[PDB]
Amino acid sequence: MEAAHSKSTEECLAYFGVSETTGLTPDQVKRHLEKYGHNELPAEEGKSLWELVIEQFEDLLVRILLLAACISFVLAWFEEGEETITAFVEPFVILLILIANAIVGVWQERNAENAIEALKEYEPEMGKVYRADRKSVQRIKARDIVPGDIVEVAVGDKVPADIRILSIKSTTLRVDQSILTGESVSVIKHTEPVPDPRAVNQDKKNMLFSGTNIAAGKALGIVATTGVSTEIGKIRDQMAATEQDKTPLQQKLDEFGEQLSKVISLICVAVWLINIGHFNDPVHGGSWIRGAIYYFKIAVALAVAAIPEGLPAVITTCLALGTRRMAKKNAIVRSLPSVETLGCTSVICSDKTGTLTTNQMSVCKMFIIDKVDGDFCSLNEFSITGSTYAPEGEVLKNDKPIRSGQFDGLVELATICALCNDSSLDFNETKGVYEKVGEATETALTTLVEKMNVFNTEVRNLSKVERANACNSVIRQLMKKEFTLEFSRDRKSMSVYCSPAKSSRAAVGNKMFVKGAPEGVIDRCNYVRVGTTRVPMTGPVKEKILSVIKEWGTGRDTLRCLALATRDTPPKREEMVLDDSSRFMEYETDLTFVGVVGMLDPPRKEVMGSIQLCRDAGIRVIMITGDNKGTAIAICRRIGIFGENEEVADRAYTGREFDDLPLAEQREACRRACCFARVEPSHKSKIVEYLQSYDEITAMTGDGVNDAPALKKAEIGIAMGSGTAVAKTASEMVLADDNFSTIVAAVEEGRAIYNNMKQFIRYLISSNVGEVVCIFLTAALGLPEALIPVQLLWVNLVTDGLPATALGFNPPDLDIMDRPPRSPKEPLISGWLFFRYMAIGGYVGAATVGAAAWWFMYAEDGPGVTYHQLTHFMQCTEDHPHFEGLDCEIFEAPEPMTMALSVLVTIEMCNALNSLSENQSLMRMPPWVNIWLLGSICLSMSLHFLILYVDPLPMIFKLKALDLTQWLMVLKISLPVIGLDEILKFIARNYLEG
Numbered sequence: 001m002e003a004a005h006s007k008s009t010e011e012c013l014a015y016f017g018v019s020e021t022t023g024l025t026p027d028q029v030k031r032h033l034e035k036y037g038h039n040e041l042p043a044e045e046g047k048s049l050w051e052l053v054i055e056q057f058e059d060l061l062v063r064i065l066l067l068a069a070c071i072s073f074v075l076a077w078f079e080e081g082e083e084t085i086t087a088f089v090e091p092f093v094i095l096l097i098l099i100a101n102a103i104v105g106v107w108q109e110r111n112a113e114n115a116i117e118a119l120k121e122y123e124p125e126m127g128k129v130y131r132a133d134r135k136s137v138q139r140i141k142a143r144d145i146v147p148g149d150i151v152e153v154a155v156g157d158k159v160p161a162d163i164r165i166l167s168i169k170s171t172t173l174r175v176d177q178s179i180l181t182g183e184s185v186s187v188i189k190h191t192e193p194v195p196d197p198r199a200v201n202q203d204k205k206n207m208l209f210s211g212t213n214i215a216a217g218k219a220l221g222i223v224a225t226t227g228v229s230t231e232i233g234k235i236r237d238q239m240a241a242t243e244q245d246k247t248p249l250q251q252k253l254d255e256f257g258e259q260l261s262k263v264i265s266l267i268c269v270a271v272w273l274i275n276i277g278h279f280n281d282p283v284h285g286g287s288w289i290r291g292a293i294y295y296f297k298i299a300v301a302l303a304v305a306a307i308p309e310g311l312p313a314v315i316t317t318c319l320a321l322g323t324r325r326m327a328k329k330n331a332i333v334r335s336l337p338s339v340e341t342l343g344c345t346s347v348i349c350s351d352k353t354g355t356l357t358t359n360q361m362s363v364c365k366m367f368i369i370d371k372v373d374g375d376f377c378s379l380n381e382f383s384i385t386g387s388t389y390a391p392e393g394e395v396l397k398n399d400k401p402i403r404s405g406q407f408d409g410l411v412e413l414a415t416i417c418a419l420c421n422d423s424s425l426d427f428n429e430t431k432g433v434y435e436k437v438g439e440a441t442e443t444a445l446t447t448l449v450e451k452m453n454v455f456n457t458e459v460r461n462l463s464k465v466e467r468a469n470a471c472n473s474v475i476r477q478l479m480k481k482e483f484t485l486e487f488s489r490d491r492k493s494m495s496v497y498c499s500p501a502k503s504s505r506a507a508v509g510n511k512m513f514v515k516g517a518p519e520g521v522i523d524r525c526n527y528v529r530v531g532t533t534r535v536p537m538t539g540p541v542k543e544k545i546l547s548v549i550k551e552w553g554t555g556r557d558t559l560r561c562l563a564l565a566t567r568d569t570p571p572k573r574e575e576m577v578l579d580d581s582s583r584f585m586e587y588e589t590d591l592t593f594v595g596v597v598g599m600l601d602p603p604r605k606e607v608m609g610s611i612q613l614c615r616d617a618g619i620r621v622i623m624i625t626g627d628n629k630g631t632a633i634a635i636c637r638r639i640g641i642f643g644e645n646e647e648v649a650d651r652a653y654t655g656r657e658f659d660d661l662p663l664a665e666q667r668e669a670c671r672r673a674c675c676f677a678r679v680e681p682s683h684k685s686k687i688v689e690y691l692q693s694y695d696e697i698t699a700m701t702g703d704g705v706n707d708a709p710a711l712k713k714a715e716i717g718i719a720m721g722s723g724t725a726v727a728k729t730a731s732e733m734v735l736a737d738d739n740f741s742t743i744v745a746a747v748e749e750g751r752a753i754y755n756n757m758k759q760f761i762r763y764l765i766s767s768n769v770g771e772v773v774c775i776f777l778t779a780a781l782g783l784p785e786a787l788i789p790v791q792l793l794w795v796n797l798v799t800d801g802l803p804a805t806a807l808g809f810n811p812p813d814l815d816i817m818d819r820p821p822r823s824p825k826e827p828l829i830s831g832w833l834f835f836r837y838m839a840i841g842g843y844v845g846a847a848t849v850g851a852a853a854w855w856f857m858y859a860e861d862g863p864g865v866t867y868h869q870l871t872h873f874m875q876c877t878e879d880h881p882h883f884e885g886l887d888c889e890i891f892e893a894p895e896p897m898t899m900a901l902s903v904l905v906t907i908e909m910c911n912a913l914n915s916l917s918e919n920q921s922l923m924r925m926p927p928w929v930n931i932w933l934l935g936s937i938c939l940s941m942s943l944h945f946l947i948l949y950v951d952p953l954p955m956i957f958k959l960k961a962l963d964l965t966q967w968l969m970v971l972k973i974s975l976p977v978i979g980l981d982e983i984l985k986f987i988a989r990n991y992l993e994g
């Protein structure tokens with residue numbers, strides 16, 4: 001039934017044609033069960049083991065490096081016995097790394113908790129219905145409940161489905177709807193209709209929502225909707241349909257390989273144009289079948305030279321280490337890719353209760369009457385410190401500590417708070433903290449009484465377990481609570497009947513202690529207590545009292561206020577009719593006003609500061625809460641989201657108000673407003689989405705089940721360490737410490753990491769440039785292969801793979817948190833940096849090819865072959881005449897190729913020092929600042945030797961160690977790089993900007 005909250009009890013029964021007295025028939029149940037399905041949230045299992053892997057290859061650069069791997073195997077057959085000892089060493093290491101990351105890849109992702117699983121933990125296994133099937137109530141499987149069922153709920157019960165309340169059995173039905181509002185306070189339901197068809201959950205006080213629980217009372221209702229058609233279902237649907245977007249960095253990479261596929265494809269065809277001068281001459285020394293082999297080989301070369309493999313492993317390494325670092329800072333990162341995105345945050349959306357606040361109601365102000373005299377009435381106001389349920393704190397009179405026991409009014413105020421209470425305190429020994437037992441607004445009263453210690457009870461030596469209710473028990477010993485007149489909706493107050501301890505039932509001196517909404521209570525008072533005396537309530541006194549209640553109830557504190565009173569001469573136990581509550585208000589009459597207490601859920605101590613720091617980093621903070629607007633705005637002023645006196649008419653909205661604005665208005669509203677109150681779960685995700693429609697990287701921080709959709713939606717969802725499992729499993733990070741401050745340090749860590757990732761992302765890609773310049777030259781220039789695609793891999797995995805990981809340790813800046821969030825679009829390489837790496841790029845390309853063509857012409861132990869007979873090195877065994885000198889097997893010699901690889905390596909070992917800073921001369925910025933980089937270059941050079949000496953290696957790589965005569969040469973061809981880029985680093989920093 002849609003909109004059951006807007007209809008009457010009769011209309012709802014009619015709608016399904018059911019009897020409140022008998023319930024559905026076995027037929028009706030079967031028909032409904034088929035028409036609506038089972039009352040269950042569809043389970044969503046994670047991707048299978050097979051999927052995870054396949055998804056691994058889904059990457060373009062990965063599918064291009066795989067295609068080349070195949071062509072590298074198809075042509076792995078065509079080979080003779082000269083090198084028949086190593087023919088498939090390439091098709092091996094090419095797919096070895098592919099399946100290496102693929103496998104490991106799934107070793108991180110397949111390890112994740114499911115949010116819907118956690119969510120279904122709010123689904124009860126059992127429910128209670130009245131089926132025509134039989135007379136007494138049946139207890140069946142919740143999933144077997146259907147719309148139209150007549151259900152019964154009782155205190156402690158976890159509501160089975162979205163139900164329209166039919167009849168409330170007790171005086172009141174109290175419900176905890178924190179899974180939908182994040183507020184634990186008991187909501188008092190009723191059965192009357194709620195007209196507005198757009199009423200938010202907080203407004204549907206005639207409905208019971210699946211997943212919530214009964215705090216107190218017994219009720220009968222009719223099921224309106226089940227399964228995914230419930231409020232918890234919408235939460236479930238927003239979490240199912242999600243799939244976090246690709247981080248900003250991943251997009252830059254996906255863009256890179258998006259072009260690499262175009263550039264390479266274009267370079268191949270490019271070289272093709274330079275191979276038309278051999279197609280003309282009518283020669284049969286190379287058929288088409290053979291003629292194609294050339295291209296498929298040069299292609300596999302370009303691919304392995306372009307695709308900067310190894311990077312995917314360098315990144316994962318930096319992040320993994322960062323995560324360990326952040327964990328030390330109390331920030332558990334569940335999604336590595338989010339670490340980078342957190343530094344790029346411009347807006348932080350935050351839940352209020354239990355996130356910005358402690359979620360522990362605390363009484364911080366209270367007053368009693370001082371003296372009365374005609375139109376003059378003065379109050380004794382006090383303040384109480386303490387923001388938790390712990391009995392730690394003091395009572396302040398004018399900011400100066402005092403003893404409550406001195407004031408008689410406070411002895412009575414405390415007596416009422418201890419007696420007119422159904423809650424208590426408890427010390428959780430396992431957790432080492434004090435926790436409430438029962439309602440929060442009542443435990444605040446319990447806690448206040450322990451702090452006041454109006455009878456000066458000796459408590460310093462009691463165990464924390466016994467300290468929890470010490471002072472309350474003392475008071476419970478003075479008066480016996482005969483019975484309590486439970487709260488009534490038409491009274492807004494509650495009272496308890498008490499007789500003196502150790503007196504006869506006939507004895508005189510009984511009292512009623514009242515607690516309630518100030519208006520009603522104060523109006524039933526005809527007297528005001530003064531110390532231990534009592535004088536008549538008069539217009540002046542009443543106005544004095546109501547004036548301060550008004551200030552406290554709506555100010556910069558907007559506190560929940562309770563008036564405490566007592567009936568000095570209550571009715572005789574007998575003449576009281578307890579079974580009829582409409583008679584209670586009259587019993588709670590002729591009252592003596594005693595005092596007022598003011599409470600609120602405080603903010604966490606370190607939140608104002610944390611938000612100021614966020615502001616410094618150019619990050620805005622917005623509040624989105626299910627709690628009411630008045631207290632939401634109050635808290636916003638207390639933590640600095642609003643000015644103590646700022647006008648917020650257009651800067652704060654309730655969910656309902658927001659829903660009224662048209663779409664374009666809603667959007668703009670998210671840019672202007674900083675406080676959204678009395679919202680529903682989907683309102684939070686919608687706000688985050690609007691924020692994202694302006695291309696802002698938004699973080700969401702919360703602790704409730706109602707925060708899940710938004711947490712899921714935000715680029716960076718951050719859950720409170722001591723919050724719900726649902727929130728945690730939907731987040732990218734968890735603040736084990738529960739401090740907002742931690743978020744700030746995580747953003748800082750996020751900015752620093754990316755800065756370092758920026759360098760080694762350039763370093764590696766840079767290297768890959770010089771490589772392609774090489775393969776390009778020795779492709780349209782005729783020359784033999786200076787470097788084979790089976791060597792590059794090792795270089796881009798171990799040679800550069802080490803300096804990279806070393807760069808991820810560059811010392812971060814100081815002004816890191818004084819600059820505004822960087823744009824998601826900010827490119828890695830462009831402008832002068834595009835050219836600077838273009839020069840170094842082509843350079844290495846010819847720096848290697850030059851060392852190869854050097855071992856021939858201007859060489860030593862090599863044939864001084866002329867450049868012409870060098871480029872035509874092919875025509876040797878076919879054209880002996882023209883081209884002739886030595887043996888035709890000196891080209892594929894392990895010398896020329898082993899001369900270019902030494903250059904490439906020596907260059908990149910110098911380029912890693914050039915990447916220690918964008919526009920900074922290595923001389924100005926000591927290349928030894930990063931000790932891990934120096935030691936890194938060593939391990940690479942040593943491994944460059946090891947890949948020569950130990951024969952089992954240079955065999956597959958086709959390399960041969962060089963001596964001083966040759967090695968000294970490399971140092972003089974690569975070393976000049978600390979100049980080109982050195983001069984270039986001067987240009988930008990002296991002719992562009994700094």
Ligand SMILES: C/C=C(/C)C(=O)O[C@H]1C(C)=C2[C@H]([C@@H]1OC(=O)CCCCCCC)[C@@](C)(OC(C)=O)C[C@H](OC(=O)CCC)[C@@]1(O)[C@H]2OC(=O)[C@@]1(C)O
Nearest residue numbers: 255256259260263306768769772773776828829834837838
């Ligand atoms: C792997 C190696 C290379 C050389 C490659 O093809 O990189 C190109 C390329 C695809 C881009 C370019 C390279 O393009 C050129 O250098 C122009 C053509 C000259 C080649 C001559 C043939 C020998 C990057 C690498 O380099 C330079 C030095 O100019 C910079 C940048 O890349 C980034 O910002 C890094 C993103 C991870 C990208 O223009 C980028 O395309 C984009 O979409 C960007 C925005 O990304």
Ligand code: ALF
Nearest residue numbers: 182352353625626
């Ligand atoms: F704790 Al909330 F909205 F769920 F402030």
Ligand SMILES: [Mg+2]
Nearest residue numbers: 182351353354
């Ligand atoms: Mg909360």
